[PDB]
Amino acid sequence: INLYDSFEASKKACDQLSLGVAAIFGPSHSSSANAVQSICNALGVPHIQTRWKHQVSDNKDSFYVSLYPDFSSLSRAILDLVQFFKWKTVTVVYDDSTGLIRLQELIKAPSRYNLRLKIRQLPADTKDAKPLLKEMKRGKEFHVIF
Amino acid sequence: HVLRFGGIFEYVESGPMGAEELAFRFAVNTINRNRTLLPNTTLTYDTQKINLYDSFEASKKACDQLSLGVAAIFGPSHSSSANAVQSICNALGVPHIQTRWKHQVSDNKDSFYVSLYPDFSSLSRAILDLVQFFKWKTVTVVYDDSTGLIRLQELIKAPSRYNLRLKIRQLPADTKDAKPLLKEMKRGKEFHVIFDCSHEMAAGILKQALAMGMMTEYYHYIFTTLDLFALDVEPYRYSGVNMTGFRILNTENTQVSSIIEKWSMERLQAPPKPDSGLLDGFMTTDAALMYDAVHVVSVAVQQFPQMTVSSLQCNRHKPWRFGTRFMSLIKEAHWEGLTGRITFNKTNGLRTDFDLDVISLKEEGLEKIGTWDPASGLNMTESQKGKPA
Amino acid sequence: DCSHEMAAGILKQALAMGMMTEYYHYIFTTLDLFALDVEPYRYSGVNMT
Numbered sequence: 276i277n278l279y280d281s282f283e284a285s286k287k288a289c290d291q292l293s294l295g296v297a298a299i300f301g302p303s304h305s306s307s308a309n310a311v312q313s314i315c316n317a318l319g320v321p322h323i324q325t326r327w328k329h330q331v332s333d334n335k336d337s338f339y340v341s342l343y344p345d346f347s348s349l350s351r352a353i354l355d356l357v358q359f360f361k362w363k364t365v366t367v368v369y370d371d372s373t374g375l376i377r378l379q380e381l382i383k384a385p386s387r388y389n390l391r392l393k394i395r396q397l398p399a400d401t402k403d404a405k406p407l408l409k410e411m412k413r414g415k416e417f418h419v420i421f
Numbered sequence: 422h423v424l425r426f427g428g429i430f431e432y433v434e435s436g437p438m439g440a441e442e443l444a445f446r447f448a449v450n451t452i453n454r455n456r457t458l459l460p461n462t463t464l465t466y467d468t469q470k471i472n473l474y475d476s477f478e479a480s481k482k483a484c485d486q487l488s489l490g491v492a493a494i495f496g497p498s499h500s501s502s503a504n505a506v507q508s509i510c511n512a513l514g515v516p517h518i519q520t521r522w523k524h525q526v527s528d529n530k531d532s533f534y535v536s537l538y539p540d541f542s543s544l545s546r547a548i549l550d551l552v553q554f555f556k557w558k559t560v561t562v563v564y565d566d567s568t569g570l571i572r573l574q575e576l577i578k579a580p581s582r583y584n585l586r587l588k589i590r591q592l593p594a595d596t597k598d599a600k601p602l603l604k605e606m607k608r609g610k611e612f613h614v615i616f617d618c619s620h621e622m623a624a625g626i627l628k629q630a631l632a633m634g635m636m637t638e639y640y641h642y643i644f645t646t647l648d649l650f651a652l653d654v655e656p657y658r659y660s661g662v663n664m665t666g667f668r669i670l671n672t673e674n675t676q677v678s679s680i681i682e683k684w685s686m687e688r689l690q691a692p693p694k695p696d697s698g699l700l701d702g703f704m705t706t707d708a709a710l711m712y713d714a715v716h717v718v719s720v721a722v723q724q725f726p727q728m729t730v731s732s733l734q735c736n737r738h739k740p741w742r743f744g745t746r747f748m749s750l751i752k753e754a755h756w757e758g759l760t761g762r763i764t765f766n767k768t769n770g771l772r773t774d775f776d777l778d779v780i781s782l783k784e785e786g787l788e789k790i791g792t793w794d795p796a797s798g799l800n801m802t803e804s805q806k807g808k809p810a
Numbered sequence: 811d812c813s814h815e816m817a818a819g820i821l822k823q824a825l826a827m828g829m830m831t832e833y834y835h836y837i838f839t840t841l842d843l844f845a846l847d848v849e850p851y852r853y854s855g856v857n858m859t
């Protein structure tokens with residue numbers, strides 16, 4: 276399929292289900308993954324997911340698995356690493372807007388621990404880390420989570 | 422002439438009819454009764470009843486609607502269903518109008534969708550302007566849904582651009598379990614809370630905060646939701662909380678009040694809920710946005726008389742004949758609706774320009790104390806009280 | 811110093827104004843304090859002896 280064309284992934288999933296298939300190894304996007312998950316949950320066919328997607332808590336679908344490790348446990352491991360290194364000022368730099376969901380335990384961590392977090396977002400261009408790192412010069416922040 | 426619109430609405434089993442579908446059909450009936458707008462064209466609808474948080478049902482109903490053929494589709498509220506509907510109609514060139522915010526992936530390349538919910542980037546910048554007006558230092562942000570951090574993506578990301586320290590807490594899965602969260606709120610001695618939830622959850626946690634004794638002169642709650650006029654502030658107006666928030670629903674104009682009154686007796690069929698704490702007989706923001714969406718797509722239709730509805734097939738990818746012209750006609754309209762001035766970003770489908778009224782809670786109830794605009798800053802007419810000679 | 815019904819009305823009007831916190835403290839001369847409804851006032855933290 277193409278880049279984030281969930282209708283095309285739905286059509287290919289319908290064609291592969293018409294051909295007959297044991298289980299569907301789904302796409303690596305988010306929207307097409309949600310579409311294939313809902314389609315196979317309607318038709319009783321097991322879904323396999325290898326990349327993490329954001330999961331809506333209202334969804335009652337049960338016909339899927341996810342072999343990427345959950346970012347709740349990953350974020351708790353990162354918080355344990357921060358507690359082991361005994362940091363105080365952490366600058367967290369992400370690139371995609373879903374990453375705040377992936378690191379939300381670290382953002383909820385200043386309520387329960389003693390920390391101070393400054394988060395920043397990479398720009399939409401690849402080579403534009405030079406202004407953002409300049410803020411790393413200005414903030415004097417030496418503990419960066421990428 | 423006869424024109425057809427696509428209506429997808431997530432229905433509730435039993436009960437009354439849904440509010441958004443009622444607003445959609447009320448907008449259709451008021452446009453059909455009026456002759457100043459669309460003089461020689463009549464509008465029809467095809468409403469659908471899909472499940473909540475499902476995309477395959479929405480895909481099947483959208484395919485059935487394109488088998489019937491519609492001019493445009495008014496999508497559902499859940500993010501997955503709206504994403505599937507948006508991809509389906511962008512594959513066929515039929516324009517999409519959505520009234521609820523959804524998280525949008527930056528790698529998406531669709532161009533046949535518009536969203537009339539105000540963008541939370543501009544809303545969060547307005548909230549930052551409101552916070553910087555109040556000279557705050559420590560802000561506790563309480564968010565309900567896990568997507569809501571993206572809705573506060575500008576607000577959370579404030580690294581040393583202003584002297585501000587944030588503490589972020591999440592509401593629990595149960596609605597009634599705010600009491601341990603409010604107990605940690607009280608013991609933490611933090612008194613400037615930004616609540617990001619729906620209006621029903623806001624009324625519920627206001628009842629919980631009243632039961633926790635959080636209603637003093639020390640608390641200055643800020644609600645990101647726009648339905649604060651649906652709240653009943655009668656058991657809180659004499660307390661001394663400040664309760665500043667925003668409103669897009671321009672109730673100052675008399676014609677908008679007349680449209681609200683004409684909505685009201687069709688709205689008062691449903692009985693009120695006294696346990697909810699919501700002021701019954703009022704427009705939500707979603708219903709007004711659906712009404713304004715129908716008006717914007719109608720005035721986009723009126724400039725394009727060569728409008729033939731053609732039935733399309735999901736099994737092929739044959740695009741609509743009048744796709745790009747009608748999409749560009751949609752993406753440049755300027756209609757005065759219930760929310761005021763309506764325009765679209767020309768590089769997006771997001772309504773990034775609006776005119777918010779900053780309201781607050783005083784002893785008379787709720788009243789307008791300021792005006793926010795994205796092009797200007799924040800007026801805040803109580804600070805404009807100093808006019809020396 | 812009032813009746814228990816008057817005490818309940820005063821407590822409701824004090825909750826409407828946000829009078830009771832952990833700062834405040836009430837003594838009731840009436841002997842029907844156990845017959846009142848202390849459900850909404852309990853979790854805020856009020857002495858109310």
Ligand SMILES: *[C@@H]1O[C@H](CO)[C@@H](O[C@@H]2O[C@H](CO)[C@@H](O[C@H]3O[C@H](CO[C@H]4O[C@H](CO)[C@@H](O)[C@H](O)[C@@H]4O)[C@@H](O)[C@H](O[C@H]4O[C@H](CO)[C@@H](O)[C@H](O)[C@@H]4O)[C@@H]3O)[C@H](O)[C@H]2NC(C)=O)[C@H](O)[C@H]1NC(C)=O
Nearest residue numbers: 546547549550765766767768769773774794795796797798
């Ligand atoms: C269509 O959508 C586009 C986004 O998809 C819109 O582009 C956005 O435009 C706004 C202007 O309205 C930009 O806002 C601000 O940035 C300036 C200065 O930049 C600071 O931000 C930059 C980010 O790249 C850095 O390069 C700078 O060095 C610095 O870090 C701020 O000064 C602005 O504040 C102004 O606005 C706020 C609220 O109105 C006030 O509080 C301020 O005091 C001042 O009034 C904004 O923060 C925004 O960055 C830009 N976004 C992108 C991605 O380009 C576009 O405008 C929109 N078009 C229409 C027609 O709606």
Ligand SMILES: *[C@@H]1O[C@H](CO)[C@@H](O)[C@H](O)[C@H]1NC(C)=O
Nearest residue numbers: 638641661662663782783784
């Ligand atoms: C809260 O509202 C009152 C109402 O008069 C106002 O006087 C006060 O300045 C407001 N702000 C506070 C207490 O920070």
Ligand SMILES: *[C@@H]1O[C@H](CO)[C@@H](O)[C@H](O)[C@H]1NC(C)=O
Nearest residue numbers: 792797798799800801802805
């Ligand atoms: C603020 O509002 C007043 C009247 O309400 C108006 O006269 C003034 O020009 C406004 N200022 C700005 C900056 O919008």
Ligand SMILES: *[C@@H]1O[C@H](CO)[C@@H](O)[C@H](O)[C@H]1NC(C)=O
Nearest residue numbers: 832833834835855856857858
């Ligand atoms: C009320 O009771 C609490 C504990 O229950 C106590 O800490 C507080 O001092 C009391 N208030 C008074 C005595 O004013």
